[PDB]
């Protein structure tokens, strides 16, 4: 912590007060900084599900390469994860080990969907807006940031009517019709 001299750094090399090997390079912290994750245990709650997908993918690739059970369940899991939005392509089954990843499950969260739909300028702005209760999917208002938005369910991410944000974008283009409140 004091920038050890040469004899000290030679004499105690494995000493590190910040980065440990159980930390795994602080990647929970790293991807929760990237996608602005509030609570500490969401990374590991997603890591359990990525481990489920990859455990099944291992145990399913250990079946013989031609039997219809392996082919049906590999294709069925691939279709389910593409439809949910974690996987970005349902083509190859090496996605079920390589491209299945806590960052993919985190890119499917509601503020990241928002920021990619240009509905907020950054992920922290999207977090603030859906905490303030501006965003509804479908009819019903969504209030928490961790909400996972599937591919067919991202067509209905809008703002609530009577939103001040909806009002100011309509009045920026002065398409505001005050009959329907915005």
């Amino acid at each position: 912590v004091r920038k050890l001299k040469h004899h000290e750094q030679k004499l105690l090399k494995k000493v590190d007060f910040l980065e440990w090997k159980q930390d795994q390079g602080h990647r929970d912290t790293q991807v929760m900084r990237t996608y602005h994750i509030q609570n500490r245990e969401d990374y590991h709650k997603y890591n359990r599900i990525c481990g489920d997908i990859r455990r099944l993918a291992n145990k399913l690739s250990l079946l013989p390469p031609t039997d219809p059970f392996r082919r049906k369940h590999e294709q069925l899991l691939l279709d389910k994860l593409y439809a949910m939005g974690v996987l970005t392509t349902k083509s190859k089954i090496s996605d079920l080990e390589n491209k299945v990843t806590v960052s993919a499950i985190c890119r499917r969260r509601l503020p990241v969907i928002m920021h990619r739909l240009k509905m907020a300028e950054t992920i922290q702005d999207a977090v603030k807006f859906i905490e303030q209760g501006h965003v509804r999917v479908g009819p019903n208002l969504i209030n928490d940031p961790a909400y996972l938005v599937t591919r067919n369910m991202e067509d209905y991410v809008t703002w609530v009517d009577n939103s001040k944000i909806k009002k100011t974008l309509l009045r920026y283009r002065n398409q505001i019709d005050d009959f329907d409140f915005s």
């Binding site: 912590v1 007060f17 440990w20 159980q22």
Partner: protein, 516 residues
Amino acid sequence: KERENQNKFERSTYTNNQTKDKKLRAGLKKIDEQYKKAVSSAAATDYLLPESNGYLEPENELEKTFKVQQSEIKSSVDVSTANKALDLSLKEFGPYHIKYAKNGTHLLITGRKGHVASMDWRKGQLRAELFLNETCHSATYLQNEQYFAVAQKKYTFIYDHEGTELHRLKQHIEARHLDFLPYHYLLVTAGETGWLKYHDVSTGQLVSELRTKAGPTMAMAQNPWNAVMHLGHSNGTVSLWSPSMPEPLVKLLSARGPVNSIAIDRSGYYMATTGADRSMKIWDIRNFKQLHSVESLPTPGTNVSISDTGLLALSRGPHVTLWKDALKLSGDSKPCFGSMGGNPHRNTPYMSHLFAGNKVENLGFVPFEDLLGVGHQTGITNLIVPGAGEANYDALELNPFETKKQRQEQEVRTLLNKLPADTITLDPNSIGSVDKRSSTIRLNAKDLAQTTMDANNKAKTNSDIPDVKPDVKGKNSGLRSFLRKKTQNVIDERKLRVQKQLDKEKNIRKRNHQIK
């Protein structure tokens, strides 16, 4: 040269249950002269000791000492100590587990709800106030005020000086008790799982996982002398543990029911354990005798603590009660609650206090000052306990006035002389010695030749066989115990000549019986 206080500075040694070498004789004579000179000159430092310990003394027979009030102490003592006797009223988060740094400079409080605050309690400087909204249980500093470990809902977390999270420990699954071993740099962890985990803070490496095998760990304390961990279980059993042996070093049967709290003296000699059977028990640690058994407390003692000058602070809910000279051998030092008719041979409380609103969570003496910090349901309260602190610290072990540069260099130096976790034994003086195998006389290779000679001639002299003796009640004759302890189906030449010498013994016993 005489030095009335030498036996504090003396050092025990090995005994057998003189020499002809001239050079070795004079070397041992120089060694004994140097040991005597070193003990005498080290014991003459008590002149150089700057301060004197505190006290309070009754000066009357109507003036008992347990009925002296904290406001009366704060009026009778100086303004600096009266300002050290702090009181934080933190009502909304839960009962506050208290913890002090090993020099008394920093305080670390944890609410049960989420509120963990590390602070310089004697200035007005807090340096971490973090609200971790899951139920925290305990915390401790590591080697400094610069890092602290908190035991949260499940995982133990480690935070830096300003409160940023450094580590989430994926092991240490449900801690309720954390304690740091400062000479070994080990964070020790126990809790609702029946497991005890030693984690090296410097390297970052989980040193030991030990099955307690006795359910959740109800209490936990560290021997400051030899760094073994006394855990108290729901059996009424204390067990002394080291990170080398996967079994407890010792298991003591302290109480009935569970064991609510354990405290160890800093000399490593006495241990006070409170059980849930309303029983405080003072234990000898070195010889494992039970010194005192104060049974039928009015309500179960939820905490015990032992100061640096040997006070005993027991806490039974609202009440805190301190006894002076209770950790002694004689039966006149058994801690009583009243003196039946004014008996001078009854250890009445040295002082007591009642936290009338609440139930205290834990106790901890402030290290080098005369205070007892008790953390309770509505925050923190320091109590001015006058006999309760080492007045003369050593400033190169741990210094209450240490600066930033001194903290930096002392951190690097103690990190450099970190003791390995394998050197933790029940006695600290057992890592210079020889094995308790490997014969106590050193061997001069003439007797090695003699040993290989009788190993060659174990046959036809039967030196590895019990000797023939007829008069030894031949149902327990040694040779038949050999024959019975051996497996009864294989046949080797050793057991053949034991059978031969056994028939010889039976025939000699037969003829001795016949002539008798």
